[PDB]
Design a protein around this ligand. Structure first.
Ligand SMILES: [Ca+2]
Length: 251
């Protein structure tokens, strides 16, 4: 049978239909709720709908399952958009890729995972992109400092992992970091037997972040193409709308 290039895609285009694809963890009874919204300003009111954190000072735990796969002998790409529309003080904006053994109804901050990737902000001192590989019972952190975006607009985050043990990180479809797994972490290191769930495990103080346009693919050129069709289409119209609102607030 024909092998797919896309393992997972989520754009939230079918209204409340997303609730059949994403599971809320019940690990705690006080997790915050994600709501479907395109927010105060956006590129397109319908296309720019995504998952938005709705409660301040709260832990979040929501995840989506997909047909399990292995990245052995292939490239792996994880990509999504993050929009901290609230002008965030402190909060996570990263994803985790888990093996199929994860119980989605029990997912939490300390559940075992394979890879963690994305922006984390906590005051001026923490504006970073995490790139964590689980290896031989340790969650190994990248030894390179990658600065994340901190404004109110939609930004595209991309992690590419290749079978030659090389990686690349992109922000807004432009390279920000690259190198070898052997050099940039203190460890087939690239390869995982099973990926089955993508999860949002976050802590936020000022809530309101919107997540959209998730993609997991073995095709790095396609991730760039989809990036331009999503974040690339949102960008200019979103900036025009916020500039217009700031002009209304000014007066
Ligand atoms: Ca969307």
């Amino acid at each position: 049978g024909r092998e797919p290039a896309v393992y997972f895609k989520e754009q939230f285009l079918d209204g409340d239909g997303w609730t059949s694809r994403w599971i809320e963890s019940k690990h705690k009874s006080d997790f915050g709720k994600f709501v479907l919204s395109s927010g105060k300003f956006y590129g397109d009111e319908e296309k720019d709908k995504g998952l938005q954190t709705s409660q301040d000072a709260r832990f979040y735990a929501l995840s989506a399952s997909f047909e399990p796969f292995s990245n052995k002998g292939q490239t792996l790409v994880v990509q999504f958009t993050v929009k901290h529309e609230q002008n965030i003080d402190c909060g996570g904006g990263y994803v985790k890729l888990f093996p199929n053994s994860l119980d989605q109804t029990d997912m939490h901050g300390d559940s075992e995972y394979n890879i963690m990737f994305g922006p984390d902000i906590c005051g001026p001192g923490t504006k970073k992109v995490h790139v964590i590989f689980n290896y031989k019972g340790k969650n190994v952190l990248i030894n390179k400092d990658i600065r994340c975006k901190d404004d109110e607009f939609t930004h595209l985050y991309t992690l590419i992992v290749r079978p030659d043990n090389t990686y690349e990180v992109k922000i807004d479809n432009s390279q920000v970091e690259s190198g070898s797994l052997e050099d940039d972490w203190d460890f087939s290191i690239y390869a995982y037997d099973n990926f089955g769930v993508l999860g949002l495990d976050l802590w936020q103080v000022k809530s309101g972040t919107i997540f959209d346009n998730f993609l997991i693919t073995n095709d790095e050129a396609y991730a760039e193409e989809f990036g331009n069709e999503t974040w690339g289409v949102t960008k200019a119209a979103e900036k025009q709308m916020k500039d217009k609102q700031d002009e209304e607030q000014r007066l």
